Design a protein around this ligand. Structure first.
Ligand SMILES: *Cc1c(COP(=O)(O)O)cnc(C)c1O
Ligand SMILES: *Cc1c(COP(=O)(O)O)cnc(C)c1O
Lengths: 388, 394
C-alpha cells in the first residue's frame, strides 16, 4: 500500500523555513527588533483569565462559538453585518477557512473555476490542484511599476462567467505588497456584478496595512454591492496566535433561507473533516474582542506594529536610494503589508542566500517585519552587489 | 449559487438534546450523552491537564508557526503511549491531527492516495461518523458482522467469515478497544485470529484508538493494537486524546503510519505533512502541548494515570451495580453482558419501540439504537433504569 505513495514536492515558504549570522526574511511572521515574534499583551491576559474561568473542555459547538462568530463578523464587516443573511464557520486557521470555502462552493457548483491573482499565495494553487479545481489567473502585478496592472486585471476578470469564483486579497497582498485603492475596489464590484462571479476574499492581514477599519474597507464595499460573497479570515497574524490555528469563514447570502442552507452545509463540512473546530485560539479572540479593556490594548499594540514596519520601509528605501543617487527602489515605501517583492531573478536569490546568508523566498519576496536598522544596510549592500 | 445547495441534515445529537430539554418531567434521565460525566453530572478538567495549562502559561514565550506535522515531543510521547517498547521510529511515520476524527479522515486520504481502488470494511455497527466521512469521500463501504443482537457480544464467526472476503489493498477498520457503540470487545486470542486473516488477505488495518485507558487500563487497552503492529508490517492507527485526557474541545489526536521500511516511512511522512498543509496547514498546538507535557512530566503523568484509573474503576463498579440490580430484578443472568462490556457505552439490545416505550413511560432518554452511557448512571438512576428495562420486556 504505502509504498505506492508518490513523493510530494516541498512548499515554497515552508521549505526555506527548514533550510534556514543568517538573516531570515522568509516565512510570513512578524518579528520585533530582537528577531522574536512575541505573544501580544491582550492575548496573554486573555489566556490568564481563561485558565481561571473555564470549568470544562467538553465538546462545544460544531460551527464554533456564538461569541466568536459574532465578534469576528463585527470586526470584519463592521456595521454592515447583516446577521439574518450571514453564515459563520469557525475553522482551523485561515487556510482551513479557504479549504472549507472551496468545498462549499464546489458543492453548490460542481462546474466552477477559480480566478487567482498573478501572483498569489502559493498554497492557494496547491490546494486547488489537490481538489482538482481548474485555476485561471488574472493580471495583478506590474513587474515594471511594481504596482497593480489594473487595466489587465479588469481585462481578465471581465471574462469570468456566472458560476466562477474570483479570489481577491482583502488587503496587504501576499506576496507583492501592491494593493488596490477604494476606487479600484468599486470598479471590481461593477465587474463582479456584471459577470455574476462569486468573490472569495482572503482576509489574513487586517491591521497590518492602514489600520483595522481601513483594511476592511474594500471587503465592506464588496459586501455592500455583491449579494453573495465569501470571506475567509485568519487570526494568526493580527492576533499573533499563529500556532493556535484559528480563523473563520463568512458566507454572506441574499435571503434568510439560503443562510440556513449554507450554515448547515458549513457545519457538515467540519463534521466530515475533523468534527469540532479548535477552541483555545477562538476563545482568546472572542475574549479580547468582547472585553473593552483588552480590545483597546490589542488595537494599540497592533498600531505600534504597523507603524514600526512602515518606519522600516522608509529606512530601507532610503538606504537603497543612497546607493542609487535617486531612483526606482521607492516602491518599497508605497507597498503596504509585511511583504514586498523585490525583482531579483531566481538565480540572484539563491546567490544571496548561499553567500550573504540572507533567506528570502525565491520570487524575491522579503518579509519587511524581519529587518531592523542593524540589518537594513546589510540587505542594501547585499542586493546592490548581487546586481541584476 | 449558494441557493442550489442541497440541505445537509443536522447532527442528530441536538435533536435528542432538545427532545430531552423540552420534557417537563422532573425525574427525566439522559443516557444519550457522548462524553464522560462525574457523579454531579459534570465533565471536569483533569488535574494534570490544569497543571499543564498553567505550566504553559508561565513558560511559553511565543506562538509562532511550529511543526507542520506536529511537535517531536508530541509524536514520540503518543507513539510510546500506544505502542510502548514496540515502537520503532525508523519505520513509524507520525502526524498531529485535529482530533481523532481528523486522524481518521487523514488516514482515509492517505490510503486513497496510495490505492485509488480502495474499499473500506467497517463493523456492524460502528461509530456513525465513520460511514459519514467515507460516504462524503465516495469510498466503497463494505460491512462485516460484529454485534450479536441476542447475546450482545461479538459474533466472531460472522466477523471472520465476512472479513475473509477482503482483497489485497482493501482497508479494514477496527476499534482498538471499547467498541463504540456496542461495548462488546474482542479478546487477545480473537485479535490473534484477526491478525491471521489480515495477513492472509493482505488488507490494511485502520485502528481507531479513542478510549485507551477506559477499558481495562492503558497497557491492557493497547494490547490488541500492539499484537497487530507486530504481526502486520503496514498498519495505520488513529488515536484520540479527547476522552482519555478530557480535552474534547482542544481537538487533539494523531495518525501513526507503521511502514514496512524506512524508505516507505519518509514517503508516508512527506505525504502526511502535505495532507495537513492542503487541508488547514499547521495543526493546533495547545491540546497536543498539554498532552506531551503531561506525558513527559513524571509528576503530572502519574497524577493523570491515577485519575484515569479512578475513572475506569468507577465506571466498572457502576456496571456491576447495574448488572446486579438487573440480576435481582429478572431472576436470571440475562443482562450479565452489561458487566462484561468494556468502555463508556453499552448497547442494551432494545428495539426502537422498546427504546421509546422506556422514554415515554419512564422519562429515560437514550440513543435510538439502545446505546447508553454508563457514566450517566448513579445510585439514584440505576434502580430506575433497571426497572424500565425489565418493564418494557427488553
Ligand atoms: C497567513 C495567510 C494565510 C493562512 O493563515 P493561517 O492562519 O496560518 O492558516 C492565508 N492566506 C494568506 C494570504 C496569508 O497570508
Ligand atoms: C470519540 C470517538 C472519536 C472522536 O475523537 P475526536 O477527538 O472527538 O475526533 C473517534 N472514533 C471513535 C470510535 C470515538 O468514539
Amino acid at each position: 500500500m504505502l509504498g505506492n505513495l508518490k513523493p510530494q514536492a516541498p512548499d515554497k515558504i515552508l521549505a526555506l523555513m527548514g533550510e534556514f549570522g543568517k538573516i531570515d526574511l522568509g516565512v510570513g511572521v512578524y518579528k520585533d527588533a530582537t528577531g522574536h515574534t512575541p505573544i501580544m499583551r491582550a492575548v496573554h491576559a486573555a489566556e490568564q483569565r481563561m485558565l481561571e474561568t473555564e470549568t470544562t473542555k467538553t465538546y462545544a459547538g460544531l460551527s464554533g462559538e456564538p461569541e466568536f462568530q459574532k465578534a469576528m463578523g463585527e470586526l470584519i464587516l463592521g456595521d454592515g453585518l447583516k446577521s439574518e443573511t450571514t453564515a459563520t464557520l469557525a475553522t482551523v486557521g485561515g487556510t482551513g477557512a479557504l479549504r472549507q470555502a472551496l468545498e462549499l462552493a464546489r458543492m453548490a457548483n460542481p462546474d466552477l473555476r477559480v480566478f487567482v491573482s498573478d501572483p498569489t499565495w502559493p498554497n492557494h494553487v496547491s490546494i486547488m490542484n489537490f481538489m482538482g479545481l481548474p485555476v485561471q489567473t488574472y493580471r495583478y502585478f506590474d513587474a515594471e511599476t511594481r504596482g497593480v496592472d489594473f487595466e489587465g486585471m479588469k481585462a481578465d476578470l471581465a471574462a469570468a462567467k456566472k458560476g466562477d469564483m474570483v479570489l481577491l486579497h482583502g488587503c496587504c497582498h501576499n506576496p507583492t505588497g501592491a494593493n488596490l485603492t477604494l476606487d479600484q475596489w468599486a470598479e471590481i464590484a461593477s465587474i463582479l456584478e456584471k459577470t455574476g462571479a462569486l468573490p472569495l476574499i482572503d482576509l489574513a492581514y487586517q491591521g497590518f496595512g492602514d489600520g483595522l477599519e481601513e483594511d476592511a474597507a474594500g471587503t465592506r464595499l464588496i459586501a455592500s454591492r455583491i449579494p453573495e460573497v465569501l470571506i475567509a479570515a485568519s487570526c494568526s497574524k493580527n492576533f499573533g496566535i499563529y500556532r493556535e490555528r484559528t480563523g473563520c469563514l463568512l458566507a454572506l447570502c441574499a435571503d434568510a433561507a439560503t443562510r440556513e442552507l449554507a450554515q448547515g452545509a458549513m457545519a457538515f463540512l467540519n463534521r466530515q473533516t475533523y468534527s469540532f473546530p479548535p477552541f483555545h485560539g477562538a476563545k482568546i479572540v472572542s475574549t479580547v474582542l468582547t472585553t473593552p479593556e483588552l480590545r483597546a490594548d490589542w488595537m494599540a499594540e497592533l498600531e505600534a506594529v504597523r507603524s514600526g514596519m512602515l518606519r522600516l520601509r522608509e529606512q530601507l528605501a532610503g538606504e537603497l536610494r543612497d546607493l542609487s543617487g535617486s531612483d526606482r527602489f521607492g516602491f518599497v515605501a508605497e507597498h503596504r503589508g509585511m511583504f514586498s517583492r523585490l525583482g531579483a531573478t531566481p538565480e540572484q536569490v539563491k546567490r544571496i542566500k548561499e553567500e550573504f546568508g540572507i533567506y528570502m523566498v525565491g520570487d524575491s519576496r522579503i518579509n519587511i517585519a524581519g529587518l531592523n536598522d542593524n540589518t537594513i544596510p546589510i540587505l542594501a549592500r547585499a542586493i546592490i552587489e548581487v546586481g541584476v
